[PDB]
Amino acid sequence: MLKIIIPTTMLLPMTWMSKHNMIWINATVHSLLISLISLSLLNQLGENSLNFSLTFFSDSLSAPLLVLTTWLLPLMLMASQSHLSKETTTRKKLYITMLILLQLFLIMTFTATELILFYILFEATLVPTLIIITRWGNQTERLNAGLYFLFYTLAGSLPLLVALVYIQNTTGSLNFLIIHYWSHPLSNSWSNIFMWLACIMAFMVKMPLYGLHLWLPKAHVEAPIAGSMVLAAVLLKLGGYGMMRITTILNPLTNYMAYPFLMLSMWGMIMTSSICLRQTDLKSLIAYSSVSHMALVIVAIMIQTPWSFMGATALMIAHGLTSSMLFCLANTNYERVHSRTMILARGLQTLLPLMATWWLVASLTNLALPPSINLIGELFIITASFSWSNITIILMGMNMMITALYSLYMLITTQRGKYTHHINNIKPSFTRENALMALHILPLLLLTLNPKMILGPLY
Amino acid sequence: YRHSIFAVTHVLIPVWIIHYYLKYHVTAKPYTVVERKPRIFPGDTILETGEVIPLMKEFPDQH
């Protein structure tokens, strides 16, 4: 696994010893090469795992997430190229350094044979993201947003650490393989109830769970484009990966401890979706759509059936790609209008047709159109929930309906209608933005050919 | 002339690939192409066996 870790580290001296005018080219090229190398991780076995060493191991749950993490950096560089043009070379190199550090931390997080190392890197990813939000943010509320994105997370994760070390004092190991092989049931006790809660709420806060989601619209709205992409695409999936990893020890308590959260998710996916119907901001709408999708993922993880887990994995990957592309489209509009308001700039299909096609495809994937992998995940989760209980379908059904509505609402408000008359600075779309949308969307429609690569270890 | 070239590059070439794909690859695997068994009526003769299916019970014909 060091064949991926070492080049990502070498991305740092390469960036800092580059020309004042060649940092972007060099970073993009070598990030793409690292992604191509990490393509090797996709090959998996039907048996346990790919145990590289005592420190890092890979699985078919870790492999798609690692590939997406490596793939996301070049797109972040391309989108960050534009709004950082007036920045001094040192500060551009600092931005690239933050992105490289975040990629390295995520790569080491998704392998993480041991739970304390996983926790350390899981919480190390907090610093570069915070600096990115609170330093290169346009609005005045970024500082406030940063505080939210910090403390919520820490409030959830400080108990987890305690629980983790406590477990090592009782079992003797936090290594994932031994934790899997030496698992024992949890008795119905108050101590076990609280240990369950401490193990769960840390990952519940980052999905985020409905009622704990308040930090997310702030952090997504006030962050730059690269921050928004990395937050929606990967940093939301850390909680889902952690729940898949840690629930192997929480049985059979999860059989009834999941009730307070399932409801909060099953009703939550309704409320947030409804919130998307009345939203005057594009970024907030996309953030709330992310909340709804991750609520469905939370339900899937809590049901704890093979179909649940396959659907949750597929939905995580698909949602990462789709939300990143939607944020990129909204940013291309914002860089022209400087407003970040849906109703202000209208009728953009007549002015920018190819970008309108990109908008249509992104909304269609967000709408869960078959046979996209979005619908594969949604359908697997819906089947699993129906097996869990026959009434869940009602809630699920409503969410589907609502989703379509706001998705097309977002497409109709901005692309269709009559253009705003007094806006005359809508230049044609650059090759950079078109290539960015193409590189977001083509992997989705290619992954719909080989679903087993994103369906996880229970395939 | 236009319709001659059209039927070659738009009908003839596609049906070659489809027929090649079906008769050598799809039918290489079992149960990929399943045909509803043809109807058998009294008096019919079967090519593989050669035997003759007997006629009926000579129902009383009237009107």
Binding site: - | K37, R39, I40, F41, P42, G43, M56, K57, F59, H63
Partner: protein, 124 residues
């Protein structure tokens, strides 16, 4: 339908119930009770695999019709005699069903007149 008007407005027990036919013994009418004969055997009537509701006592004529429709295919108007015979057999089956309906109707009529007659004799 007129039977609907009679049953839904007159005496409900006066007229028969289609869901519960028949309500009287088959031999209650006369003791001969000749049985129906089915022409096509199981094997051929399965080999032609008509349909589960087309598997009635008229099946042999349908077999003949299918035989011709397969035989004289390009001229789809070659055989009308077999279609006519099958229609005639279905008409006969329908009139037998109508006969059964009216039989149970008038049998119930006679039965009702009976127990009311014994009621009258008992009250006298």
């Amino acid at each position: 339908g007129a039977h609907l008007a009679r049953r839904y407005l007159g005496d409900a027990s006066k007229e028969p119930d289609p869901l519960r036919m028949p309500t009287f013994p088959p031999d209650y009418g006369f003791p001969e009770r000749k049985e129906r004969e089915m022409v096509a055997t199981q094997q051929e009537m399965n080999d032609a695999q008509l349909m589960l509701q087309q598997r009635d006592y008229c099946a042999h004529y349908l077999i003949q019709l299918l035989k011709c429709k397969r035989d004289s295919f390009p001229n789809f108007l070659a055989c009308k005699h077999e279609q006519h015979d099958w229609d005639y057999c279905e008409h006969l089956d329908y009139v037998k069903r109508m006969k059964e309906f009216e039989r149970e109707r008038r049998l119930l009529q006679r039965k009702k007149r009976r127990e009311q007659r014994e009621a009258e004799m008992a009250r006298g």
